[PDB]
Amino acid sequence: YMTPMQQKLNEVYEAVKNYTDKRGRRLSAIFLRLPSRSELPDYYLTIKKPMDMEKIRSHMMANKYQDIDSMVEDFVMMFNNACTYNEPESLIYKDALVLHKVLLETRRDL
Ligand SMILES: CCCCc1n[nH]c2oc(=O)c3ccccc3c12
């Protein structure tokens, strides 16, 4: 679609968005948009800096990322948030770990 760095940003975003496991489950589904404060109040009690993929996507679509590693840092904050709020035995916790590996593998390639 356009410039090298915009393309790299898009590739990072899409890799995490589109990832599917062996059963065809899209792990990013629950991460697109945070519920409201009344819907998930314990998250907002626990997490200093709320983050979801729609937030990252908006920032990206408005050309506000000046490098790739800023975008990577926002995803890492998202997954760190998930693994701070949720217990290790939860599925969302395990999904966050997987997608954090997906993110880094993508970044490693450029
Ligand atoms: C039952 C809905 C649970 C949604 C949810 N639980 N824990 C989460 O941690 C997150 O970091 C996160 C990020 C974006 C959207 C949802 C969640 C989330």
Curated annotation (Swiss-Prot):
Coiled coil: none annotated. It is found in: Nucleus. Residues 1-110 form the Bromo domain. The modification Phosphoserine is found at residue 36. Widely expressed. It comes from the Eukaryota. It is linked to Renal cell carcinoma: Renal cell carcinoma is a heterogeneous group of sporadic or hereditary carcinoma derived from cells of the proximal renal tubular epithelium. It is subclassified into clear cell renal carcinoma (non-papillary carcinoma), papillary renal cell carcinoma, chromophobe renal cell carcinoma, collecting duct carcinoma with medullary carcinoma of the kidney, and unclassified renal cell carcinoma. Clear cell renal cell carcinoma is the most common subtype. Involved in transcriptional activation and repression of select genes by chromatin remodeling (alteration of DNA-nucleosome topology). Required for the stability of the SWI/SNF chromatin remodeling complex SWI/SNF-B (PBAF). Acts as a negative regulator of cell proliferation. Component of the SWI/SNF-B (PBAF) chromatin remodeling complex, at least composed of SMARCA4/BRG1, SMARCB1/BAF47/SNF5, ACTL6A/BAF53A or ACTL6B/BAF53B, SMARCE1/BAF57, SMARCD1/BAF60A, SMARCD2/BAF60B, perhaps SMARCD3/BAF60C, SMARCC1/BAF155, SMARCC2/BAF170, PBRM1/BAF180, ARID2/BAF200 and actin. Interacts with PHF10/BAF45A. Interacts with acetylated 'Lys-14' of histone H3 (H3K14ac), and may also interact with other acetylated or methylated Lys residues on histone H3. This is Protein polybromo-1. It comes from Homo sapiens (Human). The gene is PBRM1. The chain holds residues 654 to 763 of 1689 of the full protein.
